[PDB]
């Protein structure tokens, strides 16, 4: 079970069908968020999560953001299972015109994925051949 | 097993070895096959997929797109296990020269991955 | 387990806690490199990996590269379980000011995730509803 702390009930991510890979995180701010071409603004979501250990949160743009020429500055967010702040979406305008955000509009998908333990490795001199 | 509907056999993804993470989705073009700097082109793959519940499809560029300065406009496709349309690749030219694409050229990769059930959550006042 | 071969000890990726999704891959080059607006550079990590079958490597930027307006030219690296070369990070500057990268600087994260076999499919005439 994932658990979710909402800074405000309207921050609640849009949940889809059972088959949905992700839930949509919403913008959360108290002033104008106007991302100029070639600039980025860190947009809070007002959603803080405990993602269970062994998993992590992948944050990517909603498909609607393609026509808006917004990307996450760091390409994709990676929310570790010990991260306790609210998720932030550092959104960059790679397009040619102003992008304005409406408070609570759904912007990014959060998909929770399993990951191999980063402790489970060994250093070696030679890798096994697959030529 | 993933069920795949092709609009035509030539839309068949390029499958690698057993160890390959992804399959290469192909352009299914009509007239426009070039993307100018700062422009985008919505490319149908002609591949519709039935992905088992509990998984999803991640659509990212092939590494060869790097050289060509093409990205997906929305960075990565997320194909839900109930999505039945064909997969689209909305490619944006972020570089400085035009990129001409050949029909059925391998552009993006589809990787099918597990995801947590988005219904499996609880809202909490506080958390540890 | 992930078998790792290092070109140089210092190429060792940064390992976080049990809670870390990925390990931080490092640049491996002698002098400081600068990447001008609109330009790209193919950074070797000096890390070759043997990822267990069933799994793959996803290489995305560190969150810190976001402010520096750097991306992987191909958006995200996909490391197959049969890839035996060193992982490369082809970094592109999409911003408007010069960025500089130093040796063994943590740049990208390598996350290792299960994938469905790409051989386990069937071409079908109709899908369900
Ligand atoms: Cl699509």
Numbering used by the authors:
A (entry chain C): 1 to 131
B (entry chain A): 1 to 128
C (entry chain B): 1 to 129
Excerpt from the paper describing this PDB structure:
Deoxyuridine triphosphate nucleotidohydrolases (dUTPases, or Duts) are produced by most living organisms as part of their pyrimidine biosynthesis networks. Their role is to eliminate excess dUTP, which can be mistakenly incorporated into DNA by DNA polymerases, since most of them cannot distinguish between dUTP and dTTP. In addition, dUTPases provide the dTTP precursor, dUMP. In this study, we demonstrate for the first time that the homotrimeric dUTPase of bacteriophage T5 performs an additional, non-enzymatic function in the virus’s life cycle.
To test our hypothesis, the next mutant T5 phage T5dut(Δloop), with a dUTPase sequence 28-FFGTNPAADL-37 reduced to 28-FFNDL-32, was obtained. To confirm that the loop reduction retains overall folding, without global changes, we obtained the mutant form T5DutΔloop structure (2.1 Å). A comparison of the crystal structures of wild-type T5Dut and its mutant form revealed no significant changes in the overall folding of the protein, except for in the mutated region. The superimposition of the wild-type and mutant forms, with an RMSD of 0.31 Å for the Cα atoms, shows the nearly identical folding of these proteins, with the only difference being observed in the region of interest. The results of these experiments clearly demonstrate that the short segment of the polypeptide chain, consisting of six amino acid residues (30-GTNPAA-35), is responsible for carrying out an additional function of T5Dut.
